[PDB]
Amino acid sequence: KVPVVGIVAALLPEMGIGFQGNLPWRLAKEMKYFREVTTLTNDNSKQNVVIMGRKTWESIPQKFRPLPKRINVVVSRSFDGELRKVEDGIYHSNSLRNCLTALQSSLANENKIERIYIIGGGEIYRQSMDLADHWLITKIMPLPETTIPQMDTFLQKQELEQRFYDNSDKLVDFLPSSIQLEGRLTSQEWNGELVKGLPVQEKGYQFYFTLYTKKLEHHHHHHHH
Numbered sequence: 001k002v003p004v005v006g007i008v009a010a011l012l013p014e015m016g017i018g019f020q021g022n023l024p025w026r027l028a029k030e031m032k033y034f035r036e037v038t039t040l041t042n043d044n045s046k047q048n049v050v051i052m053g054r055k056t057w058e059s060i061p062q063k064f065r066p067l068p069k070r071i072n073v074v075v076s077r078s079f080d081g082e083l084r085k086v087e088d089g090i091y092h093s094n095s096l097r098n099c100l101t102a103l104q105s106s107l108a109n110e111n112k113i114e115r116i117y118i119i120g121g122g123e124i125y126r127q128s129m130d131l132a133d134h135w136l137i138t139k140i141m142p143l144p145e146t147t148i149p150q151m152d153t154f155l156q157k158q159e160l161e162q163r164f165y166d167n168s169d170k171l172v173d174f175l176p177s178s179i180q181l182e183g184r185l186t187s188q189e190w191n192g193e194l195v196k197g198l199p200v201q202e203k204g205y206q207f208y209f210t211l212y213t214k215k216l217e218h219h220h221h222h223h224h225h
């Protein structure tokens, strides 16, 4: 009953997200968006959860982790159980799926979690296409004179577009209420695809905050007792 939201910054057209254990760009304004969206809540007495693969945890500078003011969950197959507190602000889980089931228990969470953000791993993102209710995708494009950065990790665009549609018309309303953006909603063509969302430019890059939402589903079966 808590929304599960993938949040990722991806370079078009291949949707590259990483290179050699790190982000392929350093964009302060995109960091800011990610920080604000995952931190802020509409209900002041709730926090969000952020879930991340082990390798992504290890990529965060020691100073900056665990991410302040959000419940941090790190998943590793070598960890001990489905959701276990190991330190202030840090939970360990040995299973993405079971930790999500554990976070959803209103007995455990007291209805004091507002959203669950999946904040990456390429490998984590691969397994979240079936788990996430929405995706917040920052679609990044190199500007004309900008060198395309090398990349070795990618968002699964095929599986995204199978399950989700571009709901970016509703991006503004979706975001926690107290965030202000600099763009207006814009639809732009870029290398033969439609890019729609809230525009920013920084360094050699143009980027759009977008929202994707699960497509409507037919009613095939509902479990009865």
Ligand SMILES: NC(=O)C1=CN([C@@H]2O[C@H](COP(=O)(O)OP(=O)(O)OC[C@H]3O[C@@H](n4cnc5c(N)ncnc54)[C@H](OP(=O)(O)O)[C@@H]3O)[C@@H](O)[C@H]2O)C=CC1
Pocket: 007, 008, 009, 010, 016, 017, 018, 019, 020, 021, 022, 023, 024, 052, 053, 054, 055, 056, 057, 059, 075, 076, 077, 078, 093, 094, 095, 096, 097, 119, 120, 121, 122, 123, 124, 125, 127, 153
């Ligand atoms: N552009 C963006 O918005 C973002 C990009 N990235 C990028 O992604 C890259 C890292 O991704 P990747 O290398 O795929 O690693 P991940 O961050 O996805 O972590 C992979 C590890 O997570 C653990 N794991 C995976 N699935 C599960 C599961 N189902 N249950 C329990 N543990 C699991 C395993 O850990 P173990 O081996 O210990 O068992 C696995 O080795 C980096 O380049 C990073 O910069 C990361 C976040 C955001």
Ligand SMILES: CC[C@@H](C#Cc1c(C)nc(N)nc1N)c1cc(OC)c(OC)c(OC)c1
Pocket: 007, 008, 009, 023, 030, 031, 034, 035, 052, 056, 059, 060, 061, 064, 118, 119, 120, 136, 137, 138
């Ligand atoms: C936790 C993984 C990654 C991310 C992301 C991420 C970003 C940037 N943007 C979007 N739209 N989605 C994401 N999921 C990240 C790496 C860092 O070290 C280099 C961070 O410290 C500075 C950081 O704190 C902010 C966050």
